[PDB]
Design a binder for this molecule. Structure first.
Ligand code: GTP
Ligand code: GTP
Ligand code: MG
Ligand code: MG
Lengths: 15, 156, 429, 430
């Protein structure tokens, strides 16, 4: 079954 | 088991399949694992003819699944106006409350089904019924900013 | 003897344009560098064909502003290789200017500066023009200043920094950029003249009757003041004759290196027949807060130094009497550890104005340069805006995403807190 | 410099086509790509949205996508339909029937690499790519499901570029499908994590404006899209003409987005006009200012006075006193100071642009980052939760191999978003 986007994944863009 | 077959037939809208199965003794009030009956599923997926047929042959119009949903809840949630009215005509409890404290009015209101709201109201929907957060359908419309709904819900 | 001017980011470049415009007018130089027919050779080199070329570099991370210089009235005045541009700017973000985007072009800038430095027989150092507020003006400048400190450790570096104002502001994070670049530039700068865009804005509306000042209005006024300050470097004179002397006269105490400039008279070009003001009148006008380049109140502070730079029809005995008058009319408290003697320079050439500027010709003008603890009010205003946003970490992720540690915010802020106490301690009362 | 524009699904291509019509006219470009205006301001930054082929003919840097093939034909038969690069039409055979799982996983994934090839090609012929803008609905399956897939693939491939979206939010008043809250919540989850800026265009707000203000008893998509096109023109003005403030996507973002997840903007504009009548008078600057801050002029169905502004951008277009603009903008800020967060000093920036939009001499566009936008997400959330608790039609999603936990993940993220808006709404400087 399809893996999915997790909460907070986009916060890495700024570290 | 003709029950499981009647359930799937009622969900898929296979009118003919429904007829044959009942002729062969299929339980009209069979339940799936969550306690949904063929009338719940017909009411959910919008199969009006199957609704009326089940109701002519012993379907409990006020059966509840494990979460306390009645057919009228599901019709009101999904927005099937003709089905709501058939259910009401056959004795559906307009003020049935489910495990979240929702009534059919709450659900029609939340989803913006304004025709269904008017119908429920005319059939005696309780405007003071609170859900488990203490909200009535009217609370929902004013927290929502839904002015069209709030006016309908206020009509004396 | 030579000085190299470096102009960084939109503000630095546009003010640079206005300054070199005026410098050419003052020394009799045409936009192609020719001079119809020694002092100014500190700011201009000379070719064999009689072409006088500014010792100046313009740098921006984006090309719009410098492309106007390249195609405009002075398209032939500068070394074309000293007009340097990237393609992508710092997006009002110190960290982009300092750590990311700036690193892409820093080596070219230094090699082109080296080329100017190699033409000098006795380089004094650098004049650096930039905003506090932009990502380039703040971030790239501090990168440049760091590198210039390694590559020219013995040289003096002077700044002209544009302090942000809400009337013409273009970014919410300008207080961040301002404190970040001050922190990292403090060690590398010998003397820095802050230009408060709000002070200039007010003067334009009040003294020049400009309803809504533009950068073009602000810059011509700013350049007139910069010219008053650098004139001693470009002419014969007895006060501030080289960069070293700026620090000697205006900066007795190395972290407190932010002199207040005050300029008078500022008179509308529409008032071409104004009766001329006396030495007494323009000198007095130098202790009016309304004429300052930075908004603050010097009566609330103490003076550590004071230079008066006169231009035009000014008799020395009249300056002395005018000075005697202010020293006994006015509350000017010097700190107890320095000579309370105003230093005086006089340049007898009438001040120059740009035709079609907003300024009237005058027969005498004066720029006062004073180091007063009062300018700490300007720092306090920035620091407070910094603290409001930083408490919430508003916008901080933009900087951390571009090569900067979050700890650098609090480090810069503590350094600012230390700078403010230095002012409090010097202004012992 | 360059922006690459992508339009996905029915709604995405409809408002997308409208955008291109509108800015083409503003820039003096006709449907064949020839410039025919008389202002140099029109062409100075034409390269932001248009490729320039020889010659001298201009082509939109636009990629047109849908799983439904029919969408091709309607765009092409449109007024400016022939101006798009024929190779930039990327379409499927079926399409997703309002199924976000189909869009993303199943059917989008089948299409997506074709789209990315075209994106890659538009990108390599850019001098210095700024980033991407996507137009899409959140309520369907393609614009929503495949659109967010595209976004995630573009994030992987261009991680340092700005991703901007014009996302239209579903409302029961406009479309008769009860899975739209599912699709919108799954999408909002993706946008929270992967976009830098999202203009929240609320069909609820658009319908109400048309019905109650513009007195259109039966609003069409055309009626709604007239509001959207006016808004899209306004909010991209600073990107398309010379100027000081918010002149590119990154500068706009650094000014508007204090916290990375809170990047959902509420757009507004004044004056609101019904298409095809009438006119005027032109507004005064005070009238413009007051209307552009008015709740009734917002394209999101939220009352700004129920929350606080973190940041605001305001764009005035047309010939007018810059000084009167400054006075009025200062006015609204200090008469209503309690509505602007105190811990972001000077959080309202104002731009003036001298070229008005079509039909007008003066207009104002509002861009707000307001905590009140939580009302939009609370509304979606409540409908999502009503449906998801009864697990209605869930098998339609899991049938495409989608994990049910993705529903719960998306729901939690959106409710977290709401809590965050509230946290900063109640925050104090003290
Ligand atoms: N006086 C004056 N101030 C200016 C001028 N241009 C910009 N400013 C001010 O400079 C600050 C913004 O910095 P800029 O110089 O434009 O930015 P930058 O240095 O170019 O950096 P980025 O554009 O961010 O890369 C604001 O406080 C503006 O009001 C000008 O020509 N004159
Ligand atoms: N404002 C506006 N909304 C639209 C328009 N067209 C569709 N919508 C809304 O968009 C939402 C989703 O619909 P679509 O864009 O048609 O779906 P799709 O992206 O094409 O995906 P599938 O049809 O399921 O393959 C619904 O809420 C519609 O109300 C339009 O032209 N303007
Ligand atoms: Mg710049
Ligand atoms: Mg479609």
């Amino acid at each position: 079954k399809q893996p999915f986007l997790k909460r907070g994944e986009g916060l890495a863009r700024f570290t | 088991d003709l029950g499981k077959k009647l359930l799937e037939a009622a969900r898929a809208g296979q009118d003919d399949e429904v007829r044959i199965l009942m002729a062969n003794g299929a339980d009209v009030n069979a339940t799936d694992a969550s306690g949904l009956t063929p009338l719940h599923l017909a009411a959910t997926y919008g199969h009006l003819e199957i609704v009326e047929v089940l109701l002519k042959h012993g379907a409990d119009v006020n059966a509840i699944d494990i979460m306390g949903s009645t057919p009228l809840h599901l019709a009101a949630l999904i927005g099937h106006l003709e089905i709501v009215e058939v259910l009401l005509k056959h004795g559906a409890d307009v003020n049935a409350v489910d495990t979240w404290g929702d009534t059919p009015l709450h659900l029609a209101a939340i989803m913006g089904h304004l025709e269904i709201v008017e119908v429920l109201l005319k059939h005696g929907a309780d405007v003071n019924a609170q859900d488990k957060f203490g909200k009535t359908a009217f609370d929902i419309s004013i927290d929502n900013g839904n002015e069209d709904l709030a006016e309908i819900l206020q009509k004396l | 003897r030579e000085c190299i001017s470096i102009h960084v980011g939109q503000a630095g470049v546009q003010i640079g344009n206005a300054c070199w415009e005026l410098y050419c007018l003052e020394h009799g130089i045409q936009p192609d560098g020719q001079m119809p027919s020694d002092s100014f050779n500190t700011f201009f080199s000379e070719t064999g064909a009689g072409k006088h070329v500014p010792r100046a570099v313009f740098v921006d991370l984006e090309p719009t502003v410098i492309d106007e210089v390249r195609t405009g009235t002075y398209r032939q005045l500068f070394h074309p290789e000293q007009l340097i541009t990237g393609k992508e700017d710092a997006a009002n973000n110190y960290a982009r200017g300092h750590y990311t985007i700036g690193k892409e072009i820093i080596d070219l800038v230094l090699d082109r500066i080296r080329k100017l430095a190699d033409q000098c027989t006795g380089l004094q150092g650098f004049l650096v023009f930039h905003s506090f507020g932009g990502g380039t003006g703040s971030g790239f400048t501090s990168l440049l200043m760091e590198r210039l400190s390694v590559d020219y450790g013995k040289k003096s570096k002077l700044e002209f920094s544009i302090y942000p104002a809400p009337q013409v502001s273009t970014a919410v994070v300008e207080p961040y950029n301002s404190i970040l670049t001050t922190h990292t530039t403090l060690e590398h700068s010998d003397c820095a003249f802050m230009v408060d865009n709000e002070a200039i804005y007010d003067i334009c509306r009040r003294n020049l009757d400009i309803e809504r000042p533009t950068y073009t209005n602000l810059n011509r006024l700013i350049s007139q003041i910069v010219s008053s300050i650098t004139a001693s470097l470009r002419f014969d004179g007895a006060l501030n004759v080289d960069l070293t002397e700026f620090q000697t006269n205006l900066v007795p105490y190395p972290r407190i290196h932010f002199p207040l400039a005050t300029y008078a008279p500022v008179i509308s070009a529409e008032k071409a027949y104004h009766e001329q003001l006396s030495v007494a009148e323009i000198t007095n006008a130098c202790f009016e807060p309304a004429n300052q380049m930075v908004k603050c109140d010097p009566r609330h502070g103490k003076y550590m130094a004071c230079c008066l730079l006169y231009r035009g029809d000014v008799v020395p005995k009249d300056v002395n009497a005018a000075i005697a008058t202010i020293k006994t009319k006015r509350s000017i408290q010097f700190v107890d550890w320095c000579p309370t003697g105003f230093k005086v320079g006089i340049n007898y050439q009438p001040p120059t104005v740009v035709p079609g500027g907003d300024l009237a010709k005058v027969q005498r003008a004066v720029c006062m340069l004073s180091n007063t603890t009062a300018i700490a009010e300007a720092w306090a205003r920035l620091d407070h805006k910094f603290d409001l946003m930083y408490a919430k970490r508003a916008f901080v992720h933009w900087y951390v995403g571009e090569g900067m540690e979050e700890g650098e915010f609090s480090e810069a802020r503590e350094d600012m807190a230390a700078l403010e106490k230095d002012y409090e301690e010097v202004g012992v009362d | 410099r360059e922006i690459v524009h992508i339009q996905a699904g029915q709604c995405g291509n409809q408002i997308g086509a409208k955008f291109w019509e509108v800015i083409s006219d503003e820039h003096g470009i006709d449907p064949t790509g020839s410039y025919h205006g008389d202002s140099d301001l029109q062409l100075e930054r034409i390269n932001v949205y248009y490729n320039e082929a020889t010659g001298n003919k201009y082509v939109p840097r636009a990629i047109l996508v849908d799983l439904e093939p029919g969408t091709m034909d309607s765009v092409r038969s449109g007024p400016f339909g022939q101006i798009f690069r024929p190779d930039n039409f990327v379409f499927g055979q079926s399409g997703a029937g309002n199924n976000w799982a189909k869009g993303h996983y199943t059917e989008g994934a089948e299409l997506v690499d074709s789209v990315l090839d075209v994106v890659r090609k538009e990108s390599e012929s850019c001098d210095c790519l700024q980033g991407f803008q996507l137009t899409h609905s959140l309520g369907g399956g393609t614009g929503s499901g495949m659109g967010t897939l595209l976004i995630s693939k573009i994030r992987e491939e261009y991680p340092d570029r700005i991703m901007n979206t014009f996302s239209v939010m579903p409302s029961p008043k406009v479309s008769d499908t009860v899975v739209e809250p599912y699709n919108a919540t799954l999408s909002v989850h993706q946008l929270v994590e992967n976009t830098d800026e999202t203009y929240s265009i609320d069909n609820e707000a658009l319908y109400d404006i048309c019905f109650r203000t513009l007195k259109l008893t039966t609003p069409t998509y055309g009626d709604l899209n007239h509001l959207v096109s006016a808004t899209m023109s306004g909010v991209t003005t600073c990107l398309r003409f010379p100027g000081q403030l918010n002149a590119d996507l990154r500068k706009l973002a650094v000014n508007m987005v204090p916290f990375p997840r809170l990047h959902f903007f509420m757009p507004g504009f004044a004056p609101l006009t019904s298409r095809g009548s009438q006119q005027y008078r032109a507004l005064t600057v005070p009238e413009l200012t007051q209307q552009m801050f008015d709740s009734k002029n917002m394209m999101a169905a939220c009352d700004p006075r129920h929350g606080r502004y973190l940041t605001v951008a305001a764009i005035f277009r047309g010939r007018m006193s810059m000084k009167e603009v400054d006075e009025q903008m200062l006015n609204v800020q200090n008469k209503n100071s309690s509505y602007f967060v105190e811990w972001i000093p000077n959080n309202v920036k104002t731009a003036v642009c001298d070229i008005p939009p079509r039909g007008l001499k003066m207009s104002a566009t509002f861009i707000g980052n307001s905590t009140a936008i939580q009302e939009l997400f609370k509304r979606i959330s409540e409908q999502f939760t009503a449906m998801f608790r009864r697990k209605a039609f869930l098998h339609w999603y899991t049938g495409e191999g989608m994990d049910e936990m993705e529903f719960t993940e998306a729901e939690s993220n959106m409710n977290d978003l709401v809590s965050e808006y509230q946290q900063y709404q109640d925050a104090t400087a003290d």
